[PDB]
Design a protein around this ligand. Structure first.
Ligand SMILES: Nc1cccc2c1[nH]c(=O)n2Cc1ccccc1
Ligand SMILES: Nc1cccc2c1[nH]c(=O)n2Cc1ccccc1
Ligand SMILES: Nc1cccc2c1[nH]c(=O)n2Cc1ccccc1
Ligand SMILES: Nc1cccc2c1[nH]c(=O)n2Cc1ccccc1
Ligand SMILES: Nc1cccc2c1[nH]c(=O)n2Cc1ccccc1
Ligand SMILES: Nc1cccc2c1[nH]c(=O)n2Cc1ccccc1
Lengths: 219, 219, 219, 219, 219, 219
């Protein structure tokens, strides 16, 4: 990554063994469960595009996903290139060239170029722009590998309300609803899919009810 | 987080793999047992709002809880906004804008804004204000998920006094009594819920007795 | 904690995940065995009162003990207040206020106040004064939870002498005899509680004998 | 490795126990699965040729592979020597000599020479040139130890499409196709080797289809 | 411990959790096997007397040993006091007082005093003088707890020579022979205690033989 | 070890718990398998002679080996003394004395002397000279404890060629052939010891063949 040192300046640091192993192990344990995304974002704090490729490339399984991710990355890089074309031919000697999509993606740029962009004044945050593309791709994968529709999350006749709400919001998170819809489906789909006993209790609460109130009610 | 470096100044540091993993593992092991709160507070030492969201978002289970927590956060942010309204429209070029509730919560503010608030003179401690809101929410969850009323913690006929007192103060901690009540329930509910043999001993001690004295007595 | 940095000055550092976990795990494994006290003292090297509360609060079990400890802390704080009363009302603007017992205990003082006391010239070592109170409490707990009287540690007819001496000094340590008595009980209670065969050997050694000599003798 | 310190300059640092153990354990667990290569590249971030030999030499098994790797290294060193011959005899006192192939490979050069090359202005990046040779060799080994031809990766009659695509791109990665071919084999060999039910679905999609679309289709 | 920092001076550092745990675990695993001594010496690199007591005090078992060790420490402290008496009464204000035996042992000296001695010019290396006393005690314990006399280490009729030599030098190490005797017992007791077949081979080698030669011979 | 700090100079650092434990565990797991040597060399990066003795002394088993190693060390020290005799009697006050063999071996030299040699201008690299002697000894041990002659490594009738080559080069490595012979035994002993089916294939390849080619051929 690029870090600030102890005596004030932005420099390249080797990606740590601890980071490398954390990422590989989180993928092995959690696959594309939605919580792996914030974990990825945090393990790649300060990452250069090289570091991002490193983390992605160290994953051994899930090669269908990694291939979908390449595709998403390619589409963002092409849109980057549409937006910010680079003048071709020879660069002014010893000057910074402008990044193309593939440069931001780390496939046509050196570490040194990526460092120069990232620490320039003003900076071109290539590590952050690439990370956004990756996360975009990753979220598509989370969604795709979500094993259950929220329409099938329904409270069992003797399933504790809490356990049902846990299933419901876990599913919703993977299906990747807006926080409008997570804020919203509470007074609607959550009640509808409650079991008959709990449902009567919830209806009787009246609308406006917080989730806490609903969860107390069906305790 | 924001840390002081080795050569004197406040700077942003990447959240560590060790921290990330510690938090995730404490939740996996202890769920909402009350001791997870001080652990959270300590693992988020120096956290920016981003770091706080990071820790929260890396949790995979307990999505009912995380949704209740969002709700509590929203209520605090709205109260923040009631107290400290921000003038709308365009900000003075290159100046610090004032944080809204959603800014403190990290959903409408960048890392750089959060850093600027936190290291400004005078500072706006957004990481600490958000952390307080989170802990407020978390304590509600602890309480909610407390599996037993203190009224049902009663000493078994051959349950050692110590084990009963352990159950009692563990329950009380989750139900989240004041330290008045933890100081207090000792000369009252603790004795009442003791078994007949120990209860006679405790009554006979007379009032004023410390817990130590009571625990020696019913040894 | 408060540490010296690499370039010479006393500053606050976040309590580490390693420290937090070490303490929690030592309690889980060893409960109130007497060796947990020096471990606590060492894990809380440089601790502020906040850090001390942190470590204590992260403990999930043993809530009878933690409540006894609160009581002991309260008694020391009240004695502190007897000794060092603070003038009430409003403090001189921008000056250091004097710590009360509850300030030293971290319940009525901020982190910033604790830092100011601890790094002032001359310093008020609040972290060390609180730690002493805690250890005082902890030693009472060790003693209380000691499962066996030294009067019941007696050498078995075919128990190796070493194993008996191990039991004896382990018990004595928990019962918390002075080092006079640990130096002393060797030529007396240790011999008395030896088995008949070893006892004859020890008597015949004559008095003055070191423990080494006794342990060689009954090999 | 060679790292930048905290106060601005390039210096030699000891290879860490964590790094040493990570590499050895990745080989033990993953052998020559293709993801071990980016792991190697990242664990050897900043490596001198000595460090590279260290990592390679700490591997206990796979000595056929390590011997093939020596051979590949020898061929690159000889090509280096063809390109960049060094004038023989005695070097100018106290000056930097020019690296030969065996110098870059760490067998005829000291640590101090390697440091001097690597930190000279302008630098001779011997650690990076050797690393490239090693990776060249390693990729040959990955390919060689690939247990299955992509021609034999065919979807089972009730094998989920995702699992088949995972097998397919895992195999392709080891066989080490170009990213043209990974981009390409999608609209061709991937469909051909799909099972009859999924194949009809895919054909009917029409060409142009992304992998995501295909994977949704055969869900 | 006392360490040099990164910017040149000797300062107190907290004993690390890693160190604390390493020591406790080495004792748990290896008890008083002779290799625990160099491990202790190395884990206590730079230790103050406080740190030394810390490590010793964190040990939970082996209290017979720890009591023998106290005794040995007391005897060295008394000899220290015989050699280097301290003038009694009041010390020159703000000056360094002279250490007594109990000061070096950490029982009557503060951390600050120990730091002042250790970093004074010229220094009084109290941490090293105490460590020597401890190791003296520890070696007595190793010897005492050695379970087998070297006179009973004899090669089994089908015990490989190597395994016998391993037993022999392991025993000798615990019994704590001089390196004269370890250099020496090779051409004598090692041969004598060899089995008949190997013994003939060794005799026939003639004297002067290295251990390597003997071990090859009886392969 | 001796390390460069962060602010430019060579200073003594405590050997780390991580290093100490890594070395002990590598010996426990791998004994004298040949890969333990480069691991030792790397874990002792920057070591003083004291550190080298530390690592060696922390090993609990293998005392026959450690005794052979002492002997080898003694022979190198005596050859050192033959080469570089030191003038006896009293040293010039406050000057650096010249190292003897036993000084380099750490048995008659203090830490401070070893530091002075190692950081002098010009330096006497005692840590590196001793390390070379140790490795010399260690390689003799590797060879000695090699359980199988390369003459007995022969391909089984249905043993995959790769597995046989793995056995062959593993054995050769322990027997410690030159890299001439490792480069060489490929077109000769490796083919001879192949099984009849593979042998015909290899002969038919013709000479000049790389190992890769041979391994492909007998796939
Ligand atoms: N494993 C993985 C997943 C996604 C992108 C990746 C990788 N490995 C890489 O090097 N990249 C960058 C890259 C992007 C677009 C097309 C080709 C390669
Ligand atoms: N997992 C979690 C729990 C609580 C708050 C959270 C999260 N994740 C976030 O990003 N936030 C902030 C946020 C607060 C309020 C409403 C929407 C989101
Ligand atoms: N777990 C624990 C044990 C002992 C003291 C503690 C704690 N947690 C705290 O915050 N404190 C300080 C405190 C002291 C006195 C009375 C109330 C609280
Ligand atoms: N284990 C391993 C694999 C590949 C190259 C290696 C090693 N160990 C080394 O020292 N080298 C360098 C070297 C290259 C070429 C020929 C001889 C040795
Ligand atoms: N566990 C242990 C073993 C040896 C010495 C120790 C300890 N704990 C201590 O505090 N000391 C110092 C001390 C030396 C002499 C007599 C009394 C105590
Ligand atoms: N365990 C070990 C193996 C080899 C040499 C060692 C040790 N321990 C030491 O202190 N040394 C140095 C030494 C060399 C020569 C003769 C006597 C001792």
């Amino acid at each position: 990554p690029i870090v600030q040192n102890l005596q004030g300046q932005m420099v390249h640091q080797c990606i740590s063994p601890r980071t490398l192993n954390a990422w590989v192990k989180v993928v092995e344990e959690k696959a594309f469960s939605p919580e792996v995304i914030p974990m990825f974002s945090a393990l790649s704090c300060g990452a250069t595009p090289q570091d991002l490729n490193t983390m992605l490339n160290t994953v051994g399984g899930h090669q269908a996903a990694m291939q979908m991710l390449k595709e998403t990355i390619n589409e963002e890089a092409a849109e980057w290139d549409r937006l910010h074309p680079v003048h071709a031919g020879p660069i002014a000697p010893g000057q910074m060239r402008e990044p193309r999509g593939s440069d931001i993606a780390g496939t046509t740029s050196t570490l040194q170029e990526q460092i120069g962009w990232m620490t320039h004044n003003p900076p071109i945050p290539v590590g952050e722009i690439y990370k956004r593309w990756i996360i975009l791709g990753l979220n598509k994968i989370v969604r795709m590998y979500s094993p259950t529709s929220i329409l099938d999350i329904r409270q069992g006749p003797k399933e504790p309300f809490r356990d049902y709400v846990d299933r419901f919001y876990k599913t919703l998170r993977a299906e990747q609803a807006s926080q409008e819809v997570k804020n919203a489906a509470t007074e609607t789909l959550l009640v509808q899919n409650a079991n008959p006993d709990c449902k009567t209790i919830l209806k009787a609460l009246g609308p406006g009810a917080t989730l806490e109130e609903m969860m107390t009610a069906c305790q």
